[PDB]
């Protein structure tokens, strides 16, 4: 849910003095028009607009700046520059009364993983594995990038995964819950959206790590393969029941890794449900394999985002002769920087095929 505790009208042309996202504070006049509401979450209202100069479509996220909570959203986005993270072009502030709104001017991205998946669920079809591979691979790259800074998104879900269906590019967004997790400082338990919360979070752990994002991504992967969320339920208990009904009852050791405060409860022993019986019979084995290595009870047992990219499920993307169903060519997949590969540099042998040099 929530986080931790503590314009000139000149078409109808709006002109503001907004500060750019990258570099030092050097604000400039920005004019835009054709403003209309396009999306909303639980916190921010998102507008679309056209920049008067370039004519480029943008998205303007307008969030109320409450001083009762910790708003790292602007602070975090400004330090991020990755091809699988939505770019922050400019930001500015605007004003019932005595209220300050933060405005984030972002690149406009037309679709989300959620909306696309909803299409296939309505049509009683499954998203082609190529797109599953593509979307998930770009997601893990974004996670690898922000984790290298120690930043944890803490709200990985399909509604937060913007898509450009033409170019098949995924961009992570919504850093309203993100935080740089410091080993030693506690965090808020009730974080992340339902269906995608890590088991340790559900148990109320306050000493979790960035591996919660990996769990969420496993939930997304599973959802893409299934056509529905794998761990639904309104309450934490409901969701945990669903998890156990698939992964089997967590061992005392696994419980200790999540939250030591539950090690002495006698939980009924439920036999785990085989992953191959979970998904459709046409489901690729490596997808199933990847899921099981993401959806682990023990946080440290889960793959790292970089390791996940190196998984053999994404081997098709490393093929030099792979293309998009619409005919276009694959997006940027192998332009890894030293920062992205910081957690495990030798993975570059796998991540970067010889035909990408």
């Amino acid at each position: 849910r929530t986080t931790s505790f503590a314009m000139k009208v000149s078409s109808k042309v709006t002109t503001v003095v907004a500060t750019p996202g990258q570099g030092p504070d050097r604000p400039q006049e920005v004019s835009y028009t054709d403003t209309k509401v396009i999306g909303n979450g639980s916190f921010g209202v998102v507008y679309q607009a056209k920049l008067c100069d370039s004519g480029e479509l943008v998205a303007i996220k307008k969030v109320l700046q409450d001083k009762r909570f910790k708003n790292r959203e602007l602070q975090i986005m400004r330090k991020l520059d990755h091809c699988n993270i939505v770019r922050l072009r400019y930001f500015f502030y605007s004003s019932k009364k005595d209220e300050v709104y933060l405005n984030l001017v972002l690149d406009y991205v037309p679709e989300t993983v959620y909306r696309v998946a909803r299409h296939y669920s309505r049509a009683k079809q499954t998203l082609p594995v190529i797109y599953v591979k593509l979307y998930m691979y770009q997601l893990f790259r974004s996670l690898a990038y922000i984790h290298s800074f120690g930043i944890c998104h803490r709200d990985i879900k399909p509604q937060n995964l913007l898509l450009d269906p033409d170019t098949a590019v995924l961009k992570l967004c919504d850093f309203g819950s993100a935080k740089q997790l410091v080993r030693g400082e506690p965090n808020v338990s009730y974080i992340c959206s339902r269906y995608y919360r890590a088991p340790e979070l559900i148990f109320g752990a306050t000493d979790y790590t960035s591996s919660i994002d990996v769990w969420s991504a496993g939930c997304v992967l599973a959802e893409l393969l299934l056509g529905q969320p794998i761990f639904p339920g309104d309450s934490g208990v409901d969701q945990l029941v669903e998890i156990i009904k698939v992964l089997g009852t967590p061992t005392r050791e696994q419980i200790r890794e999540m939250n030591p405060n539950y090690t002495e409860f006698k939980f009924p022993q439920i036999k785990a449900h085989p992953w191959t019986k979970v998904f459709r019979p046409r489901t690729p084995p490596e997808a199933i394999a990847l899921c099981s290595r993401l959806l682990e009870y023990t946080p440290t047992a889960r793959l790292t985002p970089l390791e996940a990219c190196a998984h053999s499920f994404f081997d098709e993307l490393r093929d030099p002769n792979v293309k998009l169903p619409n005919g276009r060519d694959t997006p940027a997949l192998f332009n890894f920087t030293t920062q992205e590969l910081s957690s495990n540099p030798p993975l570059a042998t796998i991540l970067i095929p010889p035909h990408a040099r």
């Binding site: 934490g236 208990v237 029941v241 539950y262 939980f267 009924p268």
Partner: peptide, 19 residues
């Protein structure tokens, strides 16, 4: 929530889906 109350609810639920 309290670990005691949470565990009770989960145990009650796990007993129903098992038997």
């Amino acid at each position: 929530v309290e670990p005691q109350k949470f565990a009770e609810e989960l145990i009650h639920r796990l007993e129903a889906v098992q038997r």
